[PDB]
Design a protein around this ligand. Structure first.
Ligand SMILES: CC(=O)O[C@@H]1[C@@H](O)CN[C@@H]1Cc1ccc(OCC(=O)N[C@@H](CCCCN)C(=O)O)cc1
Ligand SMILES: [K+]
Ligand SMILES: [K+]
Ligand SMILES: [K+]
Ligand SMILES: [K+]
Ligand SMILES: [K+]
Ligand SMILES: [K+]
Ligand SMILES: [K+]
Ligand SMILES: [K+]
Ligand SMILES: [K+]
Ligand SMILES: [K+]
Ligand SMILES: [K+]
Ligand SMILES: [K+]
Ligand SMILES: [K+]
Ligand SMILES: [Mg+2]
Ligand SMILES: [Mg+2]
Ligand SMILES: [Mg+2]
Ligand SMILES: [Mg+2]
Ligand SMILES: [Mg+2]
Ligand SMILES: [Mg+2]
Ligand SMILES: [Mg+2]
Ligand SMILES: [Mg+2]
Ligand SMILES: [Mg+2]
Ligand SMILES: [Mg+2]
Ligand SMILES: [Mg+2]
Ligand SMILES: [Mg+2]
Ligand SMILES: [Mg+2]
Ligand SMILES: [Mg+2]
Ligand SMILES: [Mg+2]
Ligand SMILES: [Mg+2]
Ligand SMILES: [Mg+2]
Ligand SMILES: [Mg+2]
Ligand SMILES: [Mg+2]
Ligand SMILES: [Mg+2]
Ligand SMILES: [Mg+2]
Ligand SMILES: [Mg+2]
Ligand SMILES: [Mg+2]
Ligand SMILES: [Mg+2]
Ligand SMILES: [Mg+2]
Ligand SMILES: [Mg+2]
Ligand SMILES: [Mg+2]
Ligand code: NA
Ligand code: NA
Ligand code: NA
Ligand code: NA
Ligand code: NA
Ligand code: NA
Ligand code: NA
Ligand code: NA
Ligand code: NA
Ligand code: NA
Lengths: 158, 186, 178
RNA sequence: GGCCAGAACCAGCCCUACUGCAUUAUCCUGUCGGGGAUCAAAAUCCGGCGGGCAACGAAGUGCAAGAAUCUUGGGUCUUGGUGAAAUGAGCGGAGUAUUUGAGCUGCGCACGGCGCGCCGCACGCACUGGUUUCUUCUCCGUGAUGCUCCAUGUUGGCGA
RNA sequence: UGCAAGGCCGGAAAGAAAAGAAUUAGAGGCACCAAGUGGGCCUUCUUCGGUAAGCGGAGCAGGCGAUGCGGAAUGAACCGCUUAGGGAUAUGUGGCGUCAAAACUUAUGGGCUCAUUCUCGAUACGUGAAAAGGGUGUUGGUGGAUACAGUUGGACCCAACCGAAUCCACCGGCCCCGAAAAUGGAUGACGCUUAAGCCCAAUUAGUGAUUGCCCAUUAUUCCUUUGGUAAGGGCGGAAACAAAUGGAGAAAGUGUAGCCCUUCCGAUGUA
RNA sequence: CGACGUCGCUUUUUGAUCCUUCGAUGUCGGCUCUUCCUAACCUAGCGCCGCAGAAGACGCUAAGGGUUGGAUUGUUCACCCACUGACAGGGAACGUGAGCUGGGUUUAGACCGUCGUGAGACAGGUUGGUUUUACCCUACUUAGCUGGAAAUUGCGAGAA
């Protein structure tokens, strides 16, 4: 019956998308991974060397170790009553730089830019107003919402 | 429901119709008749000046409305009972064995029906007059006379039901005492 | 008794956005026990007709429409109901009532008793007061008679609650136990 | 009397009475035209036009904050008391006023027709604006030199 | 002077703005040493084998086991609610004809139903009793056709008298037939049919507004007990005061008749 | 009456399961005796027929009454002989073993055939093989004594 190997139950998981097959591109090779970076572990099915286990597909963690052809990632791993910090050894082709902190980094750089403009006599952008407030609505087009006999005839097939 | 449904009947010159709590009495010549209709729950009225009998059903569905044309037929039947009477002529039909019917006073005895040795006896109520016609005029005829249609029949029916062929083909063996003419006395 | 349904006019639209800076405003007619059910029925029509969700729209008004003065009238109610066996069944029925809400409340009790239809399976299409000469049903047209009268028969007249008794003398009004 | 019962009052709770603001128009009227049915009408019904409050015991519509003190509600055998510190708009002293709402209004600004400044403004915001026509009571006050518990009514019945 | 890494020295810090722009009965982490378990079972949804099973096997989650209480007559598991021991007031599920508390059989609400020997119906779970098929039983829809019509009567397969509404197909609601088992028996029993049945809808009823009523080990509140991951105050005897004729106490405290007082929260449970 | 399809009912058959019982619920049949069911064989009524009569087929209401004697077999079944109006089908712990019987099943002795090297095994055949207890409580059957309407009491008072 069902067996438990390294690649068991990975028929659709370790498969390339339709018309998106092929070995990884040049921009993957030129991407710089550093220790301390957040990375997504997504197995490339065309490489089949340094591949992560099926659990770590879709998991993201920080890089703890960089090696000539490989990357070390620390991944959380809920085991019974606690989560373990697991260090997986994969090739560089199975990791992507993570945009998980992109919105937070953009928020930090907005604050410094706002601070600089505020300290030195500059025009800050106007504050956004809530859309949930009230007001007077002047409707250009007003229609009658009602059920018609045509609605019931339409829904009958054949 | 229908708010008001009614039936109208015309009363002839010599007959009087009285209603009192759904109890109808019809008195013409040759007798008087009574009907207890307290099971019907209708509004019966008599207009003496215009000589008309009306029955009304207020706020009725189909079932109570069917009972006002039944009432109109019943009261009509008493009108033609105490004006003209009811006469039922009943004939005995046989293939081989003559059916000997003997009518005494209010008593009917039937013998030799299909050769049987059992005598069938029927006692006619005093409100129905039973007679045997002259065999010279017409052969094997018995006549029931009375004012009540429901009573003149049910004597002709009881006579018919007692001469029923048993354990034989009924399509063959057509012997019996069947009612032929339903007419009036006058 | 006063009707259990109220005449509501719910007015609403989809919230203005970049795709729809000036959305269409829709006026909806519903007969509901309260305005919370009225708004629920308004957003059910908006979703299944105009593809607008209650979470992406706003309500401009949910007021009650005032009844006309009480006059004995004939009301044409265009109504529909859903059953699993037959699907959608749309009927036009005539009612004798004094108000639009009373006629529609009567039509809801009528569809419940005769067709076992509940409120949320029923859709009212139109209610209007029609003249006597446009009435098709004989059961409604029998009340147009210029001189219409009838006796009150088979009536169970209960006593005033204060004056009701348990045991009463047979042919008197005296109360033995009360 | 440490027993039984009834009424008084206190404090706290728990119930009821007493209601204002907004809303209406698919509405209310009158009149013309149609349409309707009658013995003849009227009405139900559809249109144009003129006015509008179906009117606060109008509406079964949204929200209600109304000091049970004025203006002696009820219950507490569902609490504890009889003033052994009563913190009260309720106790005690003063005073006959202030202010907070409703009317009515000033200027400016917001807001709404129409357009780059005229009209309106239901009466919003600031002057905690102006008037006082009516509607309200407002102002002071008692530490524990009590660490803790217990101990203070009235009227009968029963108990000499 | 670039990249990588370990630091050092400074800077800035809405301590995270505004756009719907979180919330928390949110003290985080770390050990040590031990017990009972290691037959389970049942449900809403997903689900495999089997004709199925009160059958065997799984997924997420609740529950019973381990737990009564209030309800569905009865029932380990359904429904309500979960449990210190007492009161009052409100509820929940379920009810308001009697049994049996509540509509002493409520309304100044609307429809439908008649069921002759397992005797209509009033069974959520509970299939914890029913199908295909049928009904000119009644009362509602939809689409057509006819209308001096349809039906009688006279004349001869066909139109004239007659004087009004008829009939064709198809869908529902309730009721009926389908509908046969062994002790006498079961809407719980009686009984109920201007229901005390079914669907819908109210709360003293077109009058003037938005809480009819009855039942909990639940909710609110009051009294008392008990234990806190409990929170605080007092504890240097203020002064004065014999009997015959205001009193007593006041412990620096885990646990006592608890040092005393105030306050808040929890309280069931098999192994 | 009813192919191809299709919808059901029953629990008098087998299967499936493994809920109760392994400090024990006596395990087949027959005899005996009672009772219940109806899917009705005869008996009472009645429809319908390819219903002339006679005999019969199909169906309805109805379980009040009845439903035998034997050869072979432990047999339930099966089969035949005979009578009859008819010799229907079933349940009650596959009703009924402190009611019987013990033919069968079902130990220990022994024979056979097949199987096994063997001891031994065979829903294969054969022959022989302990059937215990009521005096208890109910239930039934008869047989006695005897109070009691506030069903013992209240004095609590109702006349077919
Ligand atoms: C009092 C008591 O124990 O009754 C228990 C309760 O659980 C209920 N029934 C149990 C007794 C019982 C009765 C009949 C049985 O059927 C016969 C059978 O199959 N085998 C026989 C043959 C044994 C000898 C072979 N060497 C047998 O075992 O008796 C089976 C078991
Ligand atoms: K005294
Ligand atoms: K299972
Ligand atoms: K209570
Ligand atoms: K009713
Ligand atoms: K059917
Ligand atoms: K029908
Ligand atoms: K304590
Ligand atoms: K045994
Ligand atoms: K024998
Ligand atoms: K017979
Ligand atoms: K047994
Ligand atoms: K035996
Ligand atoms: K043997
Ligand atoms: Mg898959
Ligand atoms: Mg994939
Ligand atoms: Mg014959
Ligand atoms: Mg008025
Ligand atoms: Mg004062
Ligand atoms: Mg174990
Ligand atoms: Mg219970
Ligand atoms: Mg009662
Ligand atoms: Mg039940
Ligand atoms: Mg019964
Ligand atoms: Mg019950
Ligand atoms: Mg405990
Ligand atoms: Mg077949
Ligand atoms: Mg099992
Ligand atoms: Mg034993
Ligand atoms: Mg035992
Ligand atoms: Mg036994
Ligand atoms: Mg039968
Ligand atoms: Mg019989
Ligand atoms: Mg018998
Ligand atoms: Mg013998
Ligand atoms: Mg059996
Ligand atoms: Mg025995
Ligand atoms: Mg024995
Ligand atoms: Mg033997
Ligand atoms: Mg041997
Ligand atoms: Mg021997
Ligand atoms: Na009537
Ligand atoms: Na069960
Ligand atoms: Na429980
Ligand atoms: Na101590
Ligand atoms: Na406590
Ligand atoms: Na079985
Ligand atoms: Na078993
Ligand atoms: Na033997
Ligand atoms: Na033997
Ligand atoms: Na004995």
């Amino acid at each position: 019956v069902h067996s438990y190997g390294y690649k068991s139950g990975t028929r659709h998981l370790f498969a390339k998308k339709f018309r998106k097959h092929g070995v990884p591109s040049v921009s993957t090779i030129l991407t710089n991974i550093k220790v301390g970076d957040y990375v997504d572990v997504v197995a490339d099915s065309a490489v089949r060397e340094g591949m992560p286990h099926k659990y770590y597909h879709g998991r993201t963690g920080i890089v703890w170790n960089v090696t000539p052809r490989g990357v070390g990632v620390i991944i959380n791993k809920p085991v019974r009553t606690r989560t373990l910090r697991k260090r997986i050894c994969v090739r560089f082709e199975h990791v992507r730089k993570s945009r998980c902190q992109e919105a937070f980094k953009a928020k930090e750089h907005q604050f410094q830019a706002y601070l600089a403009a505020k300290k030195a006599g500059k025009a800050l952008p106007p504050l956004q107003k809530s859309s949930r407030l009230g007001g007077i609505v002047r409707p250009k087009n007003v229609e009658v919402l009602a059920r018609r006999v045509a609605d019931y005839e339409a829904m009958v097939p054949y | 429901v229908k708010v008001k449904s009614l039936c109208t009947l015309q009363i002839p010159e010599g007959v009087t119709v009285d209603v009192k709590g759904r109890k109808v009495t019809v008195t013409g010549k040759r007798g008087t008749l009574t009907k207890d209709l307290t099971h019907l729950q209708l509004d019966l009225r008599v207009d003496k000046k215009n000589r008309t009998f009306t029955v009304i059903r207020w706020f009725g569905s189909k079932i109570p409305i069917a009972c006002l044309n039944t009432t109109k037929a019943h009261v009509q039947n008493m009108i033609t009972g105490v004006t003209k009477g009811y006469r039922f002529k009943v004939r005995c039909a046989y293939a081989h064995f003559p059916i000997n019917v003997s009518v005494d006073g209010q008593n009917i005895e039937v013998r030799n029906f299909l050769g049987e040795k059992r005598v069938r006896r029927q006692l006619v109520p005093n409100t129905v007059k039973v007679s045997q016609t002259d065999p010279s005029k017409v052969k094997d005829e018995i006549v029931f006379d009375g004012n009540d249609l429901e009573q003149v029949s049910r004597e002709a029916a009881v006579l018919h039901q007692m001469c029923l062929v048993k354990k034989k083909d009924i399509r063959k063996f057509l012997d019996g005492i069947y009612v032929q003419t339903k007419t009036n006395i006058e | 008794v006063k009707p259990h349904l109220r005449h509501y006019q719910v007015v609403g639209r989809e919230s203005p956005s970049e795709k729809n800076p000036e959305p269409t405003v829709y006026k909806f007619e519903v007969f509901a026990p309260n305005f919370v059910v009225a708004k629920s029925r308004f957003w059910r029509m908006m979703r299944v007709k105009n593809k607008v969700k209650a979470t992406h729209g706003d309500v401009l008004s949910c007021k009650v429409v005032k009844d006309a003065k009480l006059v004995a009238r004939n009301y044409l109610v265009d109504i529909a109901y859903y059953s699993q066996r037959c699907g959608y069944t749309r009927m036009v029925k005539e009612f004798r009532d004094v108000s639009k809400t009373g006629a529609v409340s009567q039509a809801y009790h009528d569809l419940a008793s005769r067709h076992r239809a509940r409120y949320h399976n029923i859709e009212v299409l139109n209610v209007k007061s029609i003249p006597d000469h446009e009435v098709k049903h004989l059961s409604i047209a029998q009340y147009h008679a210029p001189n219409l009268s009838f006796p009150l028969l088979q009536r169970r007249t209960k006593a005033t609650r204060k004056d009701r008794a348990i045991f009463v003398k047979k042919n008197t009004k005296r109360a033995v136990v009360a």
